[PDB]
Design a protein around this ligand. Structure first.
Ligand SMILES: CN(C)c1ccncc1
Length: 185
């Protein structure tokens, strides 16, 4: 792909984070802690899952960023509406305001409803995410495999400002402690 020149500097919004997450000083890395991280509750925090939003809001234009997923067993990545539900249980779907892919149990899937199987020959260590607001497109790229396409959501109905979306996943297995990292431009 040739989307790299739309690169944006994403930072994580502490206020939106699940209370077990640990975000680095530079706001560029996040991991699952082994306990509550001693923050007050607020209506922005994702309560049920290890999720956090980027601080940046997008309502026009083309945007690109990259995320490092090295040695993780589970994660979700993409974008979402600023007004997605924070509390309780929900599915990641465009109907609920999410445009995402994930790794789960050794398979990759796109967060359609129902979910869609992805075909990845080279397990990615870094994921590229491209948003074209005007066109209604969200695309995912395999940076480890020379930028090959993973998935395109088209005919997107964003219906609001968009925020970068992250889920570090649970660590029930003891094999999923590694962070998500926003990669330098
Ligand atoms: C429904 N399902 C298998 C998942 C959804 C989101 N992230 C991971 C898995």
């Amino acid at each position: 792909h040739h989307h790299h020149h739309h690169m944006v500097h994403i930072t994580l919004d502490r206020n939106t984070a699940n209370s077990w997450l640990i975000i680095s000083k530079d706001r560029r890395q996040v991991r699952m802690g082994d306990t509550h991280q001693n923050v007050s509750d607020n209506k922005e925090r994702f309560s049920n899952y290890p999720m956090v939003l980027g601080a940046q809001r997008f309502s026009s234009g083309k945007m690109y960023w990259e995320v490092d997923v090295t040695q993780k067993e589970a994660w979700d990545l993409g974008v979402c509406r600023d007004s997605v539900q924070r509390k309780g249980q929900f599915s990641l779907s465009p109907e609920n305001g999410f445009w995402t892919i994930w790794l789960w149990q050794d398979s990759y899937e796109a967060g359609t409803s129902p979910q869609t199987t992805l075909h990845i020959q080279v397990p990615p260590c870094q994921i590229g995410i491209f948003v074209d607001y005007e066109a209604g497109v969200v695309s995912f790229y395999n940076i480890t495999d020379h930028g090959s396409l993973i998935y395109t959501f088209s005919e997107c109905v964003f219906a609001g400002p968009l925020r970068p979306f992250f889920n570090v996943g649970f660590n029930y297995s003891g094999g999923n402690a590694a962070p998500l990292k926003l990669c330098p431009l």
